[PDB]
Design an enzyme around this catalytic site. Structure first.
Site, PDB file in Angstrom:
ATOM      1  N   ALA A  37      24.704  39.681  19.786  1.00 49.80           N
ATOM      2  CA  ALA A  37      25.755  40.421  19.078  1.00 49.80           C
ATOM      3  C   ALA A  37      25.172  41.711  18.553  1.00 49.80           C
ATOM      4  O   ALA A  37      24.081  41.702  18.024  1.00 49.80           O
ATOM      5  CB  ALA A  37      26.306  39.598  17.949  1.00 49.80           C
ATOM      6  N   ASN A  79      19.605  40.111  16.385  1.00 50.57           N
ATOM      7  CA  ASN A  79      20.752  40.733  15.714  1.00 50.57           C
ATOM      8  C   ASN A  79      20.279  41.790  14.705  1.00 50.57           C
ATOM      9  O   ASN A  79      20.957  42.040  13.691  1.00 50.57           O
ATOM     10  CB  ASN A  79      21.663  39.730  15.030  1.00 50.57           C
ATOM     11  CG  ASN A  79      22.140  38.665  15.965  1.00 50.57           C
ATOM     12  OD1 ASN A  79      21.900  37.475  15.730  1.00 50.57           O
ATOM     13  ND2 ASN A  79      22.782  39.073  17.061  1.00 50.57           N
ATOM     14  N   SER A  86      21.714  35.228  17.302  1.00 51.83           N
ATOM     15  CA  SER A  86      21.318  35.224  18.760  1.00 51.83           C
ATOM     16  C   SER A  86      20.049  36.002  19.026  1.00 51.83           C
ATOM     17  O   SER A  86      19.902  37.102  18.503  1.00 51.83           O
ATOM     18  CB  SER A  86      22.411  35.885  19.612  1.00 51.83           C
ATOM     19  OG  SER A  86      23.587  35.108  19.673  1.00 51.83           O
TER      20      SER A  86
END
Ligand code: CA
Lengths: 205, 557
Positions: free
Chosen positions: B69, B241, B1
């Site tokens: 995340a 991330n 992400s």
């Protein structure tokens, strides 16, 4: 009016809910979700609670067991029981709104029942706040916040120690799975701040 | 992400720009759900996964938010001491303590039901037991007991009007997730949220700890410790991330590492390229990063150095020259099935050989396969998620950097041979493998492009639609399942905020009993494919002006 829920969909079918209190607002949300994604949400509920085999068969028994073994439902229920009326309204409203549509679906399935229900041989049942909460717990907490390989890491470390010796094996483990690497690009620049904690990297336990 | 937030000092024609590409894989119907809530203190618009009460991607006209995340370490494993004489008990603080247990029955369609037991200790649910050593492993999550509070925090944050109100909610989200903020005045912010344990001295978080008491967590670390920044001097906040902050440790998962080689650098390169970025330029970063081979930048220098003295007719040299002329951006040929350049194939074959010769060779089986992947692994339906630099590649990068790497090379991955020798050998393997498949003329090599598939089975591997509902896109794009952009205080518009998203295949997954597909079942699919986007409406005036339908209910609670 306190009991009014106005739903407006735009040119792409995206809904906008208008309501005057918490329960009504989330009721609107749950209602549009039941209209747009009932089969997807039903399967997500079975996925997050481990009840897939009930409708799909033996191919999913291990999956269901794995899901149940990875959480403690009563604990989630207890968290819900401790919510204030205002917070509870979010979850209750959401579930109630989906139920209003599910009830309509089961009353006139001939035109409102999503085809997948017919294809997979079953019909949708009502929802409760616990179910709404589990959609989040099982797809956000378990997929994006439950990552670990400590047991296998220990097995790797043991194997490394056997191959290279104790001190060297520990050093190689630190080479393959370092605790921190100062050359790693950081979202926050070092000039702004750095993390103050230093951690053991010699399995001192 | 991924996510890039551009503040007042780096934005062109606007005060702030937020572009988010959360990566959850691709599904049919859509992973996320579009929704607008207005009333009871809320006035928001955006989209969110599984239609959670709280919008993970959206804005309220004053501030905008997003997530990626966190990949922090919020889970430790405790080795519980058991006894063959006392089944169902474990040793904790000098006493034999009773484990909690519950019986579960799995009903099975056209089959026999199965029942089993789930066990739990003060440290969490038991994952596995080893009767030989009489040990049971319990999984302790720092967020245990705060699951519901996290869902609520993600909901109440939608009502925040400033940094102070927003962080008050961020402090209540317990999962390891990066949160982002932007606002109408041009302020930007970041918080690596979550609950993290305050561990005992000497606790190595990458390995299990005894569960007898002495190694129990002291409690949770305070919110003050969560990495965060408000209005950074750089003028921007980028993440893919990667590490949130200098010295911050990642998850103990062996496959996750934050080191010199990180894909977020590709975003940095594009943001630092020009002094300021317009909203169009910010959106364009999606297209470029989605097509960027992630290994070229990392190994091209090594490859160039290794082939420096070879003759023009040496094929090893020729493969590198091909790479040198390329910016690493993949583009489909007019056939819609092969890539214009063969670089990714060259790197994949070369990197696979290199890993086999270095990292893999230094690790005992069966752990060697943890480091053999090149990062180009796929399925015929294409990658199931985003593409990243593999864990083996990250370790290999530290080795090729030599003295520039802060990681001591306990074992020489090149096993005493000059690096150039191993690099050349991998190139020889590469030439043999590829020339055998495509011939000796590189300029005519039409390597297969990766594709993208909106799968009918959800991420768990469970059907959420009929197989036939699967949809395919020719071009794999390493981008968000959905992409949303919010632009604050545009100088080219009188509106205070502009926002857009794309939720493919469409807003609705509904199919009537006779098979008639809903009108919004696939109307965002082409838009997705060519990097298009649709306007997200917030105000009553905009919503009414773009109204397609309406329903009014009167409900008695
Ligand atoms: Ca850990």
């Amino acid at each position: 009016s306190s009991s009014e829920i106005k739903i407006v969909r735009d040119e792409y079918g995206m809904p906008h809910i208008y309501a005057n209190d918490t329960w009504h607002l989330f009721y609107g949300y749950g209602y549009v979700v039941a209209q747009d994604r009932l089969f997807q949400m039903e399967m997500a509920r079975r996925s997050t609670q481990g009840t897939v085999a009930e409708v799909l068969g033996k191919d999913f028994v291990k999956f269901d067991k794995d899901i149940r073994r990875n959480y403690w439902p009563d604990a989630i229920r207890a968290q819900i029981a401790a919510l204030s009326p205002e917070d509870m309204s979010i979850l209750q409203g959401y579930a109630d709104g989906m139920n209003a549509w599910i009830d309509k679906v089961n009353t006139n399935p001939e035109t409102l029942l999503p085809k997948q229900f017919n294809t997979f041989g079953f019909t949708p049942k009502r929802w409760e706040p616990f179910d709404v909460a589990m959609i989040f717990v099982g797809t956000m907490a378990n997929r994006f916040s439950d990552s670990t390989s400590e047991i296998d890491n220990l097995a790797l470390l043991t194997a490394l120690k056997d191959k290279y010796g104790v001190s060297q094996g520990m050093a190689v483990f630190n080479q393959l799975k370092w605790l921190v690497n100062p050359s790693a690009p950081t979202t926050i620049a070092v000039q702004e701040s750095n993390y103050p904690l230093k951690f053991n990297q010699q399995n001192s336990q | 992400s991924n996510m890039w937030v551009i503040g007042k000092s780096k934005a062109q024609d606007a005060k702030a720009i937020m572009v988010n590409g959360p990566q959850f894989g691709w599904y049919a119907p859509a992973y996320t759900y579009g929704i607008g809530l207005h009333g009871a203190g809320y006035d928001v618009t955006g989209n969110t996964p599984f239609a959670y009460p709280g919008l993970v991607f959206g804005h309220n006209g004053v501030i905008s938010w997003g997530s990626t995340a966190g990949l922090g370490d919020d889970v430790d494993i405790f080795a519980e001491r058991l006894s063959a004489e006392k089944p169902g008990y474990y040793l904790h603080n000098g006493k034999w303590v009773k484990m909690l247990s519950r019986e579960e029955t799995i009903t099975v369609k056209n089959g026999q039901a199965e029942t089993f037991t789930v066990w739990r200790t003060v440290h969490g649910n038991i994952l596995q037991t080893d009767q030989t050593t009489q040990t049971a492993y319990a999984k302790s999550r720092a967020w245990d007991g705060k699951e519901v509070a996290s869902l609520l925090a993600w909901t109440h944050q939608m009502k925040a009007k400033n940094w102070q109100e927003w962080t008050q909610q961020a402090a209540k989200q317990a999962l390891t997730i990066n949160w982002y903020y932007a606002d109408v005045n041009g302020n930007i912010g970041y918080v690596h949220t979550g609950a993290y344990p305050d561990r005992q001295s000497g606790h190595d978080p990458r390995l299990p700890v005894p569960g007898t008491g002495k190694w129990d967590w002291k409690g949770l670390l305070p919110f003050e410790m969560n990495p965060k920044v408000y209005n950074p001097q750089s003028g921007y906040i980028a993440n893919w991330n990667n590490s949130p902050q200098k010295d911050y440790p990642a998850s103990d998962l062996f496959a996750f590492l934050w080191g010199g080689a990180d894909r977020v650098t590709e975003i940095d390169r594009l943001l630092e390229q020009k002094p300021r970025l317009t909203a169009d330029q910010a959106w364009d970063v999606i297209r470029q990063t989605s097509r960027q081979d992630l290994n070229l930048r990392l190994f091209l220098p090594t490859l160039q150095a290794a082939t420096s003295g070879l003759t023009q007719s040496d094929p090893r040299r020729q493969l590198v020259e091909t790479l040198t002329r390329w910016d690493g951006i993949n583009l489909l040929n007019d056939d819609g099935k092969t890539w214009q350049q063969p670089g990714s194939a060259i790197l994949n074959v070369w990197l696979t050989s290199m890993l086999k010769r270095t990292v893999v060779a230094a690790v005992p089986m069966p752990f060697d396969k943890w480091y053999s992947a090149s990062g180009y692994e796929t399925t015929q339906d294409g990658p199931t998620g985003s593409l990243n630099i593999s864990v083996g590649a990250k370790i290999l990068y530290e080795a090729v950097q030599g003295d520039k790497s802060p990681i001591p090379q306990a074992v020489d991955l090149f096993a005493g041979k000059p690096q150039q020798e191993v690099v050349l050998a991998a190139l020889e393997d590469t030439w043999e493998t590829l020339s055998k498949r495509y011939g000796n003329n590189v300029s005519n090599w039409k390597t297969p492009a990766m594709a993208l598939t909106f799968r009918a089975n959800n991420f768990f591997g469970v059907p959420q639609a009929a197989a036939e509902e699967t949809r395919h896109q020719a071009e794999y794009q390493n981008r968000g399942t959905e992409n949303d952009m919010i632009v604050f205080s545009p100088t080219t518009s009188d509106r205070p905020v502009l926002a857009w998203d794309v939720v493919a295949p469409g807003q609705s997954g509904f199919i009537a009993p006779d098979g008639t597909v809903d009108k919004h079942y696939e109307d965002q699919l082409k838009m997705y494919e060519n990097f298009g986007r649709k306007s997200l409406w917030l105000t009553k005036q905009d919503v009414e002006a773009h109204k397609e339908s309406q329903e009014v209910l009167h409900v008695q609670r």
